[PDB]
Subunit: 387 residues, 4 copies
């Protein structure tokens, strides 16, 4: 009876009731993850012909953004779940990903991340009949309480080629440490894992066409980048709305102010006008990138490298704006909420901390470098796991 957005907004309201306490507690948000299981939204990105809801990417990412207004850790593991599904869809054969889609939709499997291209400590050995992953990995966003994992390993042949597999999260030999302890994103379980001779079947390797191959396959890093981008916008929007409520409900006018109510103070209003101009610009850039992703995805394997590159530029443009202007809102909102809004029971700084943490994993200065290469030299970005 409800649309996916309506279902997400209802869930977000329930999440908001415990979000502040859970930011302090950290750990696995098991009750919230089960609420996602029961909602149906783990099948949001899966087409209806496999039992899913058939949303376009722009709708899936809209739900990521909606969760991020209240709970960016939940938004992160939810968005990464659909990124893992995109990974098998783009990197493997229909005989592999179609059953995975059907089982995920039927059983509400939660997919977690164990793919770190910049962590070559996990290696794969070939034992003829099967292969085995062995080593350690970090930044395993949402591996705990998951049913399936996307795991990477290096095959030390001619310098070391990355190999990606989809495997059950409880398979023998996998030890998920859940030592994730960070100032932000405190419920994404982005801790460590140990792989001890973990068996991987040929049928579980994502090889055809595999990573960084066709332009369509090369949408995978762009989906990841735009997932983060929607999170960034959601965090800024949630911070803004929380500040609004506080300004109107609790903030007292400064005794030197010319007005009697905070909501008429000329400096307070100018701050809110600057927040508005920033948010409006981010919103249009993010939504334009999402529409371009919809259009690129619809071309499938016929996607051109040119169209992929223009999408990549549009996403990076949105990400820079969401990162920089978003973090500024999360800091400067304290000037309109005031000295009492720093009470630890409110944890109003959680928006800033979450966004500060997540904007560092892909350095902004090198995003500007890439965008300048387009703006000055008309050079398309080179497809990587970050671009």
């Amino acid at each position: 009876l409800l649309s996916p957005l309506q279902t997400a907004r209802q869930l977000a309201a329930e999440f908001a009731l415990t979000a502040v306490e859970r930011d302090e507690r950290g750990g696995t948000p098991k009750a919230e993850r089960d609420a996602l299981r029961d909602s149906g939204l783990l099948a949001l990105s899966i087409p209806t012909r496999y039992g899913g809801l058939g949303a376009r990417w722009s709708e899936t990412l809209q739900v990521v953004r909606e969760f991020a207004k209240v709970d960016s850790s939940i938004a992160h593991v939810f968005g990464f779940h659909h990124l893992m599904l995109a990974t098998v869809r783009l990197f493997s054969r229909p005989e592999q990903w179609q059953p995975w889609f059907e089982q995920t939709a039927r059983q509400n499997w939660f997919w977690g991340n164990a793919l770190n291209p910049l962590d070559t400590r996990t290696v794969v050995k070939d034992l003829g009949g099967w292969r085995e992953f062995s080593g350690k990995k970090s930044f395993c966003s949402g591996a705990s309480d998951s049913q399936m994992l996307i795991a990477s390993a290096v095959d030390e042949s001619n310098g070391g080629k990355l190999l990606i597999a989809a495997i059950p999260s409880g398979r023998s030999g996998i030890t998920l440490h859940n030592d994730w302890n960070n100032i932000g994103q405190r419920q994404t379980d982005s801790g460590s894992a140990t792989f001890e001779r973990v068996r991987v079947e040929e049928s579980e390797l994502l090889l055809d066409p595999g990573p960084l191959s066709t332009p369509f396959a090369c949408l995978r890093p762009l989906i990841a980048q735009l997932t983060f981008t929607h999170m960034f916008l959601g965090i800024a929007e949630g911070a803004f709305e929380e500040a609004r409520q506080y300004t109107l409900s609790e903030t007292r006018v400064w005794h030197k102010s010319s007005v009697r109510e905070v909501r008429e103070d000329p400096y307070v209003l100018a701050h809110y006008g600057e927040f508005w101009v920033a948010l409006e610009g981010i919103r249009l850039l993010v939504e334009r990138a999402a529409a371009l992703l919809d259009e690129a995805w619809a071309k499938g394997p016929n996607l051109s490298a040119e169209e992929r590159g223009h999408l990549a530029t549009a996403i990076a443009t949105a990400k820079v704006a969401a990162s920089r202007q978003g973090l500024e809102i999360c800091s400067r909102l304290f000037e309109v909420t005031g000295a009492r809004s720093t009470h630890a029971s409110l944890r109003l700084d959680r928006h800033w901390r979450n966004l500060r943490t997540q904007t560092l994993h892909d350095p902004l200065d090198y995003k500007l470098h890439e965008l300048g290469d387009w703006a000055l030299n008309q050079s398309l970005p080179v497809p990587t796991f970050y671009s």
Copy 2:
């Protein structure tokens, strides 16, 4: 048979050949205004049933933006000509503006500005069957070399009531001074005017419904605001493109740089990335406001105050971004063009000077106040001649 955009682009390419020397001379760009007369573009906004081209406002404003890339003074008088046509369309009866539209399209009349709501030095006396305007006016953008003028006067009853008329620019008693000397917009003829017992017939007064009446008539200041906004964007786009050509052609690498070519300098590329993110955000905000103007214009007299207010907010948001981020591009581009690009024969500072002058006639701080009133309090802007 070229489209209006193609026609405007061809003219802009010709204007570009002399724009630098004309920035120096100032005065009236009579040759360029005659090129506009010959082009048909003075009828761009006039519906086809009166002999015009039938463009939507977004298309008319796109031409303003295109002209502003190469010559913001021409962009200004061209945009203001269409604003004058909008003024008679919105404030007077069809018995008045339909003949004016037909004559303008048939004879390529150029319409000029003599409407300043601030300056109240012009007063209107009633002589029975006719009236007379007498006084001084400033900022008469495009009055020189025009066929028709929109002129305002104050009637001295009940503290003053503003009266607006459309009258031929050469009518007895009108003196245009051509004493316009400004650091920017140096070919807009925005000088001074003197009216001495200028006869004004009742059929020339714009009374039904007159200014600041219906939401539809209250589109007039919004068209003005969005005309300036398209000019601001065009100036920044033209400055950006001129900087690109200089960086790639003339600028030398700094002897402390690690790279052989300025094309690859990490700081140069980062600047161009920041210019790109700024321009892309402005572009989407301006084009969104343009689309909302098309949709509101289509409502005609059925337009609601609520839709007018949301359009107003969208335009002001775009105007703030275009003003602030546009001026920043026009200043900071010198860091990527280098010490030789300040040669007086290039007049590369003309973009900054033009934007610096035009961003002052409506103070940004009070636009942010208005936007904060919306963002914080959900208060729609109050219709005025600037909002």
Copy 3:
């Protein structure tokens, strides 16, 4: 025999060993406060004739800054202790403050804050030979584990008159709640207090000359402002130094960088150059204000309103720079320390959180208003408890 600066540096090195874990715990830093008692530094500002060290204000504030590099909560309660001593020195008769000074230096009394001019929930009744304070107070910075308190109350005559007293912290009727829970300054004990018929002798009231009387007595809010300002600078300096160590020890180069070492990355170096320019400007502004405070203090009761006003302007100028540029360093340092520096065991965000909390108790926008009144109109600031 060490100098006070050397003694403070030694203590700061010891405080640094546990500052991160104490930021987590919160509560009262009893061990560190006892280390202050043993150090002699609680008598730093007390003249030698009373058994103190005889420091100038610039020297006392230098120690506040030194502590703030490693532990801004300790810096806060230490600076506020000396502010309390300044309060009795400036507002009461030598018959009152000379014994308090002698006893403080002999017994290493820690003085705490219970003076909030905003909060008027505490009232004083006159019972003839004595008075009684009853009510609630908030923001009681350093009241816990103190020997003496500076407490204010309102007398309900002629719309309210503020009364200030110095009283022992354990006097019957005083309850300190230790309910202080804030995102920053987590060991300043700035919780709540309750007074119930707290007896106050006439000899404990600070009436002659009392607050906001002579220009010399009006140094009290300026000492408070410059104490915060030295804390703001110290926080930014400590954050900068902690970032340096991380950049050089732990941060890895981005795989798109041209350089092998983060030490040589052009964007990293540019960030550190911008941090340097900011810190150097703040440092000179703060030290100039400190020198002007020494010179004004030396005038004693002969201080003129004009010299007080110029000092006020100098302090506010330093405070704006330290607040704004300091918070920027504390945020932007994460771009040069990288994605691994957000580990919760490092609490590298503690500098930003501490500065973000403390910069709100006196709104920056109205400090800029005051400074513009000087810069434009040559109007001296009006003495208040914040200016």
Copy 4:
């Protein structure tokens, strides 16, 4: 009867009367240069034992700053005159520079610049008995109407070594084109020169100890950098004062303002407070660098490389602040002077144009790179002609 500063301020008042008209005219300010000749200030930096006034560098640069408030072109050629005297003082033998100092003080010789290390088009040939400079040069600041020139040439031996000479400006073979045509600094005569077999005696070569030799000799580029820096501060201070006068005299309050007078408008006052904080920070950084230059100069040939390096860092820090914050004041002052202040008769943009032009000859991004190398790595700057 007047001190040099008083004499300069009196001259500055006379210069201010024609400054706006001369910014338009360009060319050589011959009347103003003769006024400098008659003032005695061309001997300001020459010790009294040679007939000069014996000012310290901080006083000479204070006069540069004072001229720059009203006329940055005059400030530039005046400052470069004393830089040329410093060049012979630091690079040549007492038997060379002592007579040059005596003759300059006795005859008020004006020294001009023809030294461009980045213009290797002028070469020197050795004819045994004498040498000859031949080729072209650009950026010859103030060579016109000068008595002496500092000229450079490359000796094409082992790659090309730079050779510096002091020679009469009217010597046979020198053709000063005076084609200087720039958007700012329009009266510095920084045009071109042609050298046609210009004879140079051994006694005119600056060889012992020559350029970039001892730390003391290496003060020459630092004097140049700090001369520009004092100019930058002076320009910002003059722009600020001119804006003040306009705000208080001519600016009208915006019709949406809450106040009746511009000087009480809260946004206007906040702008002026930001100008104040910026100017105060620049002032202290510039004055601190000037004091350090005084102290370094006084050490003479005993100056250590360490003390030179710390001076270089202090100057670069001041220059970055003066450049960036100065240019921001020159742009943002238009928001408090308003729409009528762009009148071309006022040329209020001349401050921005002058500072925009002069901040480009040493790129700010690479200054930040150098300062970061100090801040992060504690690496002293490497002496060059720009550092």
